[PDB]
Write a protein that binds this ligand. Sequence first.
Ligand code: NFG
Ligand code: NFG
Ligand code: CA
Length: 769
Amino acid sequence: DKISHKIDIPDSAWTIGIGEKFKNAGHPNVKYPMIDDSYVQGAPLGGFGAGTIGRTYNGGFSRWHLEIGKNKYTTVYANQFSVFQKVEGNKDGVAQVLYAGEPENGYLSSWKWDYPKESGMYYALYPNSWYTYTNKDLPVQLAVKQFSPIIPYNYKETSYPVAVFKWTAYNPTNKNVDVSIMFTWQNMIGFFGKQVNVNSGNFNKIIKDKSKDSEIVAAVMGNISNDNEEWNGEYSIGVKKVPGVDISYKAKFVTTGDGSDLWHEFSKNGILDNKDDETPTKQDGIGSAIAVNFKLQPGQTIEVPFALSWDLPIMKFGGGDKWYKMYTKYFGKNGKNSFAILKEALNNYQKWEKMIDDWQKPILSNKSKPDWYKTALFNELYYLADGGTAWENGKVGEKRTNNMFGLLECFDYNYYETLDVRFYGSFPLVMLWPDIEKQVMRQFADTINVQDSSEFKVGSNGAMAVKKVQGMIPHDLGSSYALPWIKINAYDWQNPNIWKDLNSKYVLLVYRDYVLTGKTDKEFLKYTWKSVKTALDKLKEMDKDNDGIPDNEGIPDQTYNTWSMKGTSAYCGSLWLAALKAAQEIGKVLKDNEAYIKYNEWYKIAQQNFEKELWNGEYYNFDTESDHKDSIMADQLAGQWYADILRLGDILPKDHVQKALKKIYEFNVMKFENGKMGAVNGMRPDGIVDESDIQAQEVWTGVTYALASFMKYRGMTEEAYNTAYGVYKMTYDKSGKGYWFRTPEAWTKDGNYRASMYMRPLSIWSMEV
Ligand SMILES: O=[N+]([O-])c1ccc(O[C@@H]2O[C@H](CO)[C@@H](O)[C@H](O)[C@H]2F)c([N+](=O)[O-])c1
Ligand SMILES: O=[N+]([O-])c1ccc(O[C@@H]2O[C@H](CO)[C@@H](O)[C@H](O)[C@H]2F)c([N+](=O)[O-])c1
Ligand SMILES: [Ca+2]
């Protein structure tokens, strides 16, 4: 490896060998069908709300999130980079697709597949990833840096459906070598959203944009239809000329054939035919190719940028609604703008690289933090783009000031903005994209007094319930299978209108968003204040026994949706206490004296009773009425965790909080698989895991990262990082279970998982507060 020195990969990048087999991989541990796309994954490309594309460490474009809200894992084999090399003096060169695999059927059989093992590495530090190619049959060593411009405090480039591929080529040998790099791409119009004739009308055109000191050559892969539908739009690939390189292209090769129309050209001398052909296809799949060819002298380096864009302006959800995607604000809505997007990327990628470096640098440069922590911190952010992210710029045929936003819980449970989970998962948004965060919270505020008396069948018990009760915060803002932002509470397995954590978490999120954006946004507090008061007042009505605390009902009525709490729980009770303290503080800011007094009174009573009912001398009991009420819950003091972040002070005594956290580390971490796998949710006082429900026996990745942040704030530095390390290890390390770029909600002691690609572990960003 002589190419790594010519590029700048951070030491904290996650690494794996190209073509590496992973032996230890985990699988779903539930009885029902669950997504398992394997460990062959990578950092995604694509902006927020753009649709994303997962290019794996093997080189394939395989995890397709272009249909917003859907996860489709299939390798589109025509989508590749390939290389040709010929040493000056040899009669023949060699050509190789840079993919560690081959197609399953006979399409593209002419291409040179099966990039060999032990011949290159993949690196990732989201939003960047890299591949290096160090192959005994490729005298010129190559690397590529690939990324999309995901930039904190930037709502423009961050939305773009674009990727850059910045290639570096170096000749360490003593002979001249002719080199070509070729990008192939299938015209994927009709890959989704088209019910018949999936390739019909697809056609490819070549754009040559020549001006002074700029030449861009691109293929635009579109359809003859000017219809405005979810399926229609354009893909583009292309390259920017640099000194010493020539560009060639092929506008149309058949992807549903043996590929030799293209490959006979590329494998000869790495130069394509420059054949334009705008003939639309009927049944055949078609694709385009863009190549560069150059001669490298001994010791010479060259850099050349390629790019990929996709202009698919309309997202459709299963309930029938069609919306424009965010990026259309910047490029238009007609679906004929892929070249414009590509050109912007090819002309500005160096600036974008520096913007990414500028935001990553303060963390990367902090030599007090271990590299493993940085690996997880940055790479967990993959989910902000890969979580079915929806970000609208108008309903098709409808303009508003704001752009509604939603992130999925996960794909197995297809619910946008599950608030009980976003309590943990939304940290990166408040810290790095606060205008999105505040928009989402205003969406929730607007739902508070919505009443929908239509009934639904509650899946767990068969009872009928009102869809949405006035004064109750919704569990979620809909499903991609139905009507995001329009039909809320798509979750129907239980009734969200009786949950005991939604209303408190809502208030805590509101106050969090004020505090972590500088305690200056009074307008945000004003917008949300009525909903905050309503939320707390409604929750107070669920106190059955007049102890001042809402009662859990002995069935699941909070985020641990199969683990029943009864009476006063540490979890919901502590959240309630913190939410009351937050509302007091908002009351002071807004000069609402009567609210301040009321919530102060409720707080003092509830605090006294919480302590009496639950403090046992060592920790806070799980609850007051369950069979295993004395279990040690990892998340028992979630309200105090948020109170620390919100600078609300001690809601419980410092000594008792310290004792409880030490107990949790000693038991839930250190007595669970030697503290190498995170914090198990429930442990009995005898040091055996609580077996009352599956969720008690699970480590929740997002709960564990949040607990690590709580320990860190309380000065338990070693315990904090040791706790978080188990989650990092399981996700990323060779000794783990292979969950990189698909961090699950949970695993059990065997390492097997539930719900890959999960919102909650974004909570690792609470460790940066
Ligand atoms: O000059 N050539 O080497 C060559 C070879 C195959 C060619 O055509 C190829 O034929 C294969 C066998 O029917 C099909 O599977 C491919 O789809 C087609 F590209 C072409 N061509 O039509 O461009 C040229
Ligand atoms: O998920 N959301 O973004 C969202 C927002 C407002 C929503 O609700 C809307 O709220 C407005 C302001 O409170 C009211 O004027 C409308 O009557 C109501 F439809 C809903 N919803 O009714 O399901 C959902
Ligand atoms: Ca009570």
